[PDB]
Write an enzyme that holds these catalytic residues in place. Sequence first.
Site, PDB file in Angstrom:
ATOM      1  N   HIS A   1       9.640  -1.789 -10.334  1.00 46.35           N
ATOM      2  CA  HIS A   1       8.835  -2.977  -9.957  1.00 46.35           C
ATOM      3  C   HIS A   1       8.050  -3.365 -11.343  1.00 46.35           C
ATOM      4  O   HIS A   1       7.231  -2.762 -11.880  1.00 46.35           O
ATOM      5  CB  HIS A   1       7.623  -2.714  -8.811  1.00 46.35           C
ATOM      6  CG  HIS A   1       8.610  -2.448  -7.668  1.00 46.35           C
ATOM      7  ND1 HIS A   1       8.179  -1.684  -6.837  1.00 46.35           N
ATOM      8  CD2 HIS A   1       9.377  -3.425  -6.996  1.00 46.35           C
ATOM      9  CE1 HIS A   1       8.855  -1.838  -5.648  1.00 46.35           C
ATOM     10  NE2 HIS A   1       9.603  -2.734  -5.834  1.00 46.35           N
ATOM     11  N   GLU A  14       4.054  -2.975 -12.788  1.00 50.78           N
ATOM     12  CA  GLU A  14       3.585  -1.615 -12.778  1.00 50.78           C
ATOM     13  C   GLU A  14       3.467  -1.006 -14.111  1.00 50.78           C
ATOM     14  O   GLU A  14       4.329   0.054 -14.297  1.00 50.78           O
ATOM     15  CB  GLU A  14       4.243  -0.821 -11.785  1.00 50.78           C
ATOM     16  CG  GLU A  14       4.347  -1.326 -10.281  1.00 50.78           C
ATOM     17  CD  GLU A  14       4.958  -0.909  -9.214  1.00 50.78           C
ATOM     18  OE1 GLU A  14       5.569   0.332  -9.584  1.00 50.78           O
ATOM     19  OE2 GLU A  14       5.318  -1.315  -7.967  1.00 50.78           O
ATOM     20  N   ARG A  51       7.121  -8.661  -9.948  1.00 51.91           N
ATOM     21  CA  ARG A  51       7.531  -7.500  -9.303  1.00 51.91           C
ATOM     22  C   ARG A  51       9.115  -7.298  -8.939  1.00 51.91           C
ATOM     23  O   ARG A  51       9.658  -6.319  -9.167  1.00 51.91           O
ATOM     24  CB  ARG A  51       6.951  -7.456  -7.841  1.00 51.91           C
ATOM     25  CG  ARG A  51       7.423  -6.385  -6.878  1.00 51.91           C
ATOM     26  CD  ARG A  51       6.889  -6.654  -5.487  1.00 51.91           C
ATOM     27  NE  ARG A  51       7.587  -5.708  -4.667  1.00 51.91           N
ATOM     28  CZ  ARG A  51       7.150  -4.279  -4.130  1.00 51.91           C
ATOM     29  NH1 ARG A  51       6.241  -3.891  -4.768  1.00 51.91           N
ATOM     30  NH2 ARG A  51       7.880  -3.805  -3.363  1.00 51.91           N
ATOM     31  N   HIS A  86       6.348   4.741  -9.443  1.00 47.99           N
ATOM     32  CA  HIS A  86       5.620   3.361  -9.139  1.00 47.99           C
ATOM     33  C   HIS A  86       4.153   3.454  -9.669  1.00 47.99           C
ATOM     34  O   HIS A  86       3.318   4.765  -9.750  1.00 47.99           O
ATOM     35  CB  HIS A  86       5.770   2.948  -7.750  1.00 47.99           C
ATOM     36  CG  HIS A  86       7.158   2.630  -7.452  1.00 47.99           C
ATOM     37  ND1 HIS A  86       7.539   1.293  -7.032  1.00 47.99           N
ATOM     38  CD2 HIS A  86       8.311   3.244  -7.260  1.00 47.99           C
ATOM     39  CE1 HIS A  86       8.683   1.447  -6.836  1.00 47.99           C
ATOM     40  NE2 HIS A  86       9.308   2.234  -7.018  1.00 47.99           N
ATOM     41  N   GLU A 108       3.305   7.053  -6.920  1.00 47.63           N
ATOM     42  CA  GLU A 108       2.586   5.944  -6.914  1.00 47.63           C
ATOM     43  C   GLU A 108       1.386   6.458  -7.921  1.00 47.63           C
ATOM     44  O   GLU A 108       0.629   7.143  -7.641  1.00 47.63           O
ATOM     45  CB  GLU A 108       2.202   5.388  -5.704  1.00 47.63           C
ATOM     46  CG  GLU A 108       3.380   5.307  -4.717  1.00 47.63           C
ATOM     47  CD  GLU A 108       4.075   3.969  -4.932  1.00 47.63           C
ATOM     48  OE1 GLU A 108       3.244   2.847  -5.558  1.00 47.63           O
ATOM     49  OE2 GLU A 108       5.195   3.904  -4.842  1.00 47.63           O
TER      50      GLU A 108
HETATM   51  O1  LIG Z   1       5.672  -0.605  -4.866  1.00 44.62           O
HETATM   52  C1  LIG Z   1       5.439   0.515  -4.591  1.00 44.62           C
HETATM   53  O2  LIG Z   1       4.989   1.053  -5.620  1.00 44.62           O
HETATM   54  C2  LIG Z   1       5.313   0.866  -3.275  1.00 44.62           C
HETATM   55  C3  LIG Z   1       6.769   1.465  -2.786  1.00 44.62           C
HETATM   56  C4  LIG Z   1       6.457   2.213  -1.488  1.00 44.62           C
HETATM   57  C5  LIG Z   1       7.902   2.930  -1.453  1.00 44.62           C
HETATM   58  C6  LIG Z   1       8.185   4.195  -1.993  1.00 44.62           C
HETATM   59  C7  LIG Z   1       9.272   4.827  -2.015  1.00 44.62           C
HETATM   60  C8  LIG Z   1      10.446   4.219  -1.200  1.00 44.62           C
HETATM   61  C9  LIG Z   1      10.320   3.262  -0.948  1.00 44.62           C
HETATM   62  C10 LIG Z   1       9.159   2.022  -0.876  1.00 44.62           C
HETATM   63  C11 LIG Z   1       7.515   0.250  -2.534  1.00 44.62           C
HETATM   64  O3  LIG Z   1       6.836  -0.692  -1.658  1.00 44.62           O
HETATM   65  O4  LIG Z   1       8.625  -0.039  -3.093  1.00 44.62           O
HETATM   66 ZN   LIG Z   2       6.265  -0.616  -6.750  1.00 47.00          ZN
END
Ligand SMILES: O=C(O)C[C@@H](Cc1ccccc1)C(=O)O
Ligand SMILES: [Zn+2]
Length: 307
Positions: free
Chosen positions: A69, A72, A127, A196, A270
């Site tokens: 993404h 980030e 994103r 992330h 995260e």
């Molecule tokens: O964007 C982010 O940082 C949050 C992340 C939550 C996620 C983690 C692992 C697997 C799937 C989804 C997403 O929304 O992709």
């Molecule tokens: Zn992300």
Amino acid sequence: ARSTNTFNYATYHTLDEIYDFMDLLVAEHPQLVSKLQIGRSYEGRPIYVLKFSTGGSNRPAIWIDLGIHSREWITQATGVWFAKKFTENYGQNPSFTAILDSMDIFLEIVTNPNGFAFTHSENRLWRKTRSVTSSSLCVGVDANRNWDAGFGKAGASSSPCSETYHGKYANSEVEVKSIVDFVKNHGNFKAFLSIHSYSQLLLYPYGYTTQSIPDKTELNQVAKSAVAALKSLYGTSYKYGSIITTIYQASGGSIDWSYNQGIKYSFTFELRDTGRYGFLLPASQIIPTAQETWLGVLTIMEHTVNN
Ligand SMILES: O=C(O)C[C@@H](Cc1ccccc1)C(=O)O
Ligand SMILES: [Zn+2]
């Protein structure tokens, strides 16, 4: 700039700076680190993975990806840092040295080059990928919704214009497809981490289902250990749990896929912070983010080498 020892780790870089760094490091540690091109992005930029290895056949390996993404930015920053640190800690840290002596590490710093370029170029907060096409004026797919792990179920948008668009089919984005093919072809990955930000969570599968993974007790105990580790430096507090439980149901996510491939040790991080700065974390918190996340990751990797 001239050597990895001169590179400024305490600022955010552009694409070409990051790429040029890769080449420096390879140059400075040719016996330790290789540069691989596993594909090219939608707009034809090369996609790179650094492989850190001390030899051997097709050793069990550790996958890390950063910057799926694009906005980030703290992730790509940590990624650069990690790269250097692996090169620094080998033969100095007994733990880290036991790891590389027996496993390889595959690090993808800028998972999503195109959207990375685009955050510098035009919109800081982009994103998605930069894929076009179809019956839409909206560009880009949520690459962390594009994986074949409950693809298309709830926890992703079927609107192209959506920030969580899942794309046309599982693996439609060449940025994903390229990791898929490479990990399936390697066939000896043991851990799979995807970095992330923000909100300080350590997450295991699943996102797409309420169903519990069979390894829940172990991965939770690993998560717990990791979090304890991380917190030790600066006291940064992380929550841990399964996606769906911890954050939200999200379909077509990395970790669900990896885990479904038999890669037991699938975690997403995260990173900082919790909302104060969100995606626009201050250059000043690069290093202390990298250092602490390090310990977290090193704890997962020791558990990996041991089971
Ligand atoms: O964007 C982010 O940082 C949050 C992340 C939550 C996620 C983690 C692992 C697997 C799937 C989804 C997403 O929304 O992709
Ligand atoms: Zn992300």
